[model samples]
Target chain A: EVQLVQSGAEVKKPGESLKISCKGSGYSFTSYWIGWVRQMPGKGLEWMGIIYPGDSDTRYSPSFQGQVTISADKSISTAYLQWSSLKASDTAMYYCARGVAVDWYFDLWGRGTLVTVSSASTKGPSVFPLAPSSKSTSGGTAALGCLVKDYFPEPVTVSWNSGALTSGVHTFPAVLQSSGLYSLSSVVTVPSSSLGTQTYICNVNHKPSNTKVDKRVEPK
Target chain B: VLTQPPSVSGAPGQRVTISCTGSSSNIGAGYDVHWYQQLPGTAPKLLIYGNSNRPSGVPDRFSGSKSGTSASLAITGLQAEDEADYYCQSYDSSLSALYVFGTGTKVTVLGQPKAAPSVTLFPPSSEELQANKATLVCLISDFYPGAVTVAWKADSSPVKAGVETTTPSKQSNNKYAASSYLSLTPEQWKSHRSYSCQVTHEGSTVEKTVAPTE
Candidate 1:
């Protein structure tokens, strides 16, 4: 039941200041070392640093050294991650985890706090109009397709569903847009004989807004 | 290379196993491996440390072992709550005291719903508020999924600086509790008539408001 609860999500503009907290409870507050992990958008977890709240002993990963500050207050069993000036590249989900007194591996973790670093004037990623197209296959089936374009963020999910087909839905990975955005496509295949009155739905989910858009089409 | 699967799925009550593979420069060289269990959106808990040692009160069902250059964490009698991300760590002496962690493995329990936590705020004592330094504490308890957020405000403005909170620790009954402290000077404490402590968990927000005493 030991838990490391973290601060809430943060949205920051470039050159803005930020500081987030992680609080620990249950066990002896200063008995263990608390560490921080960073997961960049679409990337794996990276160890940022660790702090021993008992004595304020801290260690940082070379990659994060000097880029941020790690500190703790033993009186409250809380640790912190702070940045004097955040960059757009700093947009990521950060976690605080508990470690053993003598080891570096984290056994308990805090739920992550997402930090979005963007220009104050910039908006979240947008999903353009999605239209489904159909094509007949030699196997007497049809393929319905949709394309999502002009999105600002790199991560997106595309899914397809249809009531007319036997074959399952197949979604390709998202392609990176030249403007540092993302483009994705998904397709569903169905029996051409059953396509005349069938409804196909293309669902696109964008992370920034947690929005899901469903575009439906009936192929004749 | 330390490697782990991106995910593993299993039904409740079943056994699920995750592996962490390393090289002679690390685990194969006889270094110990440790394991962590991370619930989503929360910090991870050390499941097993020093290869097979479980922290006090950790269930024996969560176990760890090492074989040659690889390590394994096995969860027997898995529960819905056990579904989480698992990571392994070991030391690599060749890299000048580098500690390497495997890419995380997420455990998914199919066909399960989550339980939300309940939170409460306990205001600072009148003596502390009237003293040279004031301290405020917010208590969050009985929370499942173990991830929660605590924030403080004075006169409706967020108090960002000079706050400290404990990691959620487990009570004897397996429930969790965490406290946050807000430090303020007597002058600031006396000037502020309204102070609030907010606790957020699983999309629910609870707040306790206190008025300064003369």
Candidate 2:
């Protein structure tokens, strides 16, 4: 059987950064690439990135571009998962995987390591969809309603369009789910006159897929 | 090194063949070939390799072998547990530090056959009659100097604990060939009875099976 043993748990104060390791056994270390995965406290798992131990080739997840670093050492048969800054949000379990490439799910898995970040260091929730529904009657007046959740104290908005509204709105509110994860629901009502294929939508401005760049407006 | 090419296809619960090819340099004398199984969404585990060597906990329905520059892995009386991607790996003097893999073969369990083999007969001669008995044997005709084990199973149930087994020995060609035999009584050889041969080498499982001939 193939076995993957991971490094120890880590506890860090706000603003402190940390790294963890995973070691592979029973096979040639240099022949395969190792990858990292993140599971936030009570949240679903996410792919981070991969590193080729033989030649040090690395690829990052679009969501983790500026958030983490992945590296490996073939000589010692180990791989490292790192985060530069410690935020309470970064506290979670991390895993390392080995495979021919990192294009899909891990074929060889390592047990996870827990990293806890102090609460004070965690960032406050960002604003989600929060708007009044847009209601439309037969060529009549319409009311718009929307709710934004989770990201407390964050700003939000809601808007409508004719055909394809090129400009996207950013402010909105969402409903909170029982799982600690937030869910949002919004409804826009318009008069039959404005009910063409070009209808409006409610959008949320969470972190972009790639964090290295500025916020980009997109449709929900 | 030799390996099964990419994309081997099989129905669920049926036997399938995976072949590996080696160049002149590796198999001319002694060399071991192994195979592994990587389940969907899981790591690859050693199946068959080293011409024929089985790991300690593997099932007996997997077997392996070699003939000239070719090596083969066969699975018999397949099960859903057998549905996975299988690869062949071998050591080569040319690439001293690493073991190479053959493109994997995927096994799918097809609906059960009306009658699978209760025993597989491997007679050196076509006229090697057994009256009404049935037997199974696996041979790895070409391999470098190495030891291998051959095992037998009934209805996917392994007989490894107390059943007899055979060890591979040097052949006239100065290479290695392993064979295992399991004898079944006439009644046991009737329809609905199935038998499998599992060959293991260097921590891998290679297998084959034969049911009552339709």
Candidate 3:
């Protein structure tokens, strides 16, 4: 019955300071340990650090050291992650997990606090991810479709599974869907032998918004 | 990385096979593939490590195999309790020799009856009211499949902050149990209208609520 409740999402501007909290209950929080993880939009999970609340012993990943502050309050069984000066690059989902591993070993987890750093900005394109519908073509390859709908003023960057795709991507020209909106379709090919045995990710990188949308398709 | 099906199903006494697909970077590179079984409300246990060898306690009905870039688990005469999640583990040279797990596949033993879970919301104690924070506990129990969602609410509006839910923990009686917590400040506890814990399972939503006391 371990529970870790995190603070709500926050929107801040660059050069501003911010701190978020995760309160642990239902178990002896001080006796056990806690950790933090980061997931930037469209990226894999990053283990930030770990701490023991009672003794104040703390440790962070070598890459995360000094980039952010990780502290806790023993009396309230609550942990905190703070930034002295927010940067637009700091936008990501921060989760408070309880398994004490710097790798993929979290047992209990907090829902996560989304920190979005933004100020005055022009409206950018929002993305929609469609499923990889049916088809297995000849010569041991599956041609999957990805619809990148609603493109606007900025150019959209499309990626397939972190450069894991050896096949070429075929994208259709923007078909004007409506005013201020254009839609495009991209197709990625993979060896038919590899289907259903792995994960395929279609990452849509929208530069203006500072956020990316990743659509994951499991070869079923 | 490894890949497996989202789900697979079979009736009792029938055989089932769960495949773990890999690539030349790992499975085809001659790295050994292992397997684990995650029972409801429990941690994953090593079923087959070093290709196809099961530990002492595991039954003989479960067998493993490796061929090319793929490893597989073969369940002979599948039983009711065999309904669980299965995953494969391996080392990959793609990411500088990293460890990876297959996208797990859930084995469904068909024909089991569906059951609804019971829900209860517990209020805070008097002494806790004196503190700066108050946490209400929501308990959901006795569900089949053990998959459920806990949604927090204030009166009728959705509540996101201060909400924490755990994965279901298996009970001894062939059932599962889980808890969710909703935290509130002393002032909010006194002023807030009502707090609700909604548990959704088997296509039904049930809510349990608690309000301020005199």
Candidate 4:
């Protein structure tokens, strides 16, 4: 039960100082390395840095070098991710996970803490209504597509919830939009037998504002 | 040049496999591979370390193997809870001792409902309160599928500072558990009458509330 517990959600303004903590337990804390991860609003996970509590050795990802500080206090078996000043773009979910002595892959992870950097200049993403389209039934199977467009900050997750059982759902990688935002599509397919009257919900989660939108399938 | 598919999908109880292909500079160079599982909104966890070794407490259902400049991670008896993002990593000798990560693969389990975690709150001990600094622990246990979130609220408002939460680690019984600690000054603890710990697993939320006693 190796554990790396992390700090909670934070709402801050630009230039505000912040420091988040992650406490490790269930094993010899000093023996392992704890690393920090950053998931920017609607973006994929980024490895920010890592620290060895035993010796206070620290390393930062090239992109994050000099931008943030990673430190630990061995007495409390706790690690930290700190920033002397935060920008609006610093807003995102941060997580800490236990890593191998010398690798980037994490062996255990903390549930993420949401950090919202609110400033007059920062605007939340605009989520478009989900557009539903259906494919012709063939081979006892049918597919439905949900198109999500014009969302800023890049990464978004699309999930499917059908009243009936579904065989699968797939979300394509988001494409960059001319407006500097992103657009993506997801598809959910079901057995033709379960398609006539059941409603399939396409759920889209945009991480920035922690907003979600659901669109129902109108199969024709 | 390690490549992985963008996604993999399967049904509960079925077996699913993901491939990680590398070039001669890396996997072909006889370096070992490792696998990580990242559930949405959570940090990634190592599934297979050092190519084929499963860490202590990892179930037998998950296995890894390598052959001829490539590696594969297989999930047997795929449970709905197994759905997540998987990544592969290996050291590339030609790249000047650098480590490389394959593009991530997302695993989806169609139509199976997720299990919710049990939540409990343990107030600070009397000795801790007497010391003027206390740590309130929120213990979350028995969650299925491994991606559960814990949050602390004081009197219904979110408690954002000085709270430390552990990664949801696997229990011996194949379930998962995590804890969140809220460190409070003795003054802050006695002033707040209502505290709640919330656990969210899969789309379901469970909460436990407790009031600190003198």
- Candidate 2 on A107-174: residue-level lDDT in tens? 56676787766532222332222111121121353323233323321122333332244322221123
- Write one digit per residue (lDDT tens) for candidate 4, span A126-201: 3322222231344776655565545655457777773243345545555543344455555554677766666778
| Cα-lDDT of candidate 2 | 0.53
CAPRI class assigned to model 3: incorrect
- lDDT tens digits, residue span B45-121, model 4: 77898889898778899999999988999999988678788888786766543346777788877643455675545
* Residue A48 lDDT (model 4): 80
Interface RMSD of the predictions, in order shown? 19.5, 28.6, 19.8, 17.6
Give the per-residue lDDT of model 2 (tens digit) for B1-214.
4545565555665787788787766554456666667664444555664567676777787888988777888887677677677766554556441334455565555443322111122321111123443333333334433456667777888765423333443333334444344445545656436666776665665666656552
Model 3, A43-74: lDDT tens per residue? 43456777889887887766678998899998
TM-scores for all candidates? 0.50, 0.33, 0.44, 0.51
Q: Proportion of native contacts in model 3?
A: 0.00
Best by DockQ: 1
- Per-prediction DockQ comes to 0.13, 0.01, 0.01, 0.10
What would the per-residue lDDT of candidate 1 be over residues B95-210, giving only the tens digit for each residue? 54445677989787654344455433333444334445454544455565557898899999999886666566444345555556565676777788888888888898888766
- The 0-to-1 C-alpha lDDT of every candidate, in the order given, reads 0.69, 0.53, 0.69, 0.71
* Model 2: interface root-mean-square deviation in Å: 28.6
What residue runs in model 1 are displaced by over 4 Å at the alpha carbon? A7-14, A25-31, A39-45, A73-78, A87-93, A114-141, A154-173, A189-214, B1-31, B35-48, B53-88, B91-99, B102-214
Worst 10 residues of 2 chain B by lDDT: B117-126
- Structure candidate 3, residue pairs in collision: A197-B3
Which 10 consecutive residues of model 3 chain B have the lowest summed lDDT? Answer: B124-133
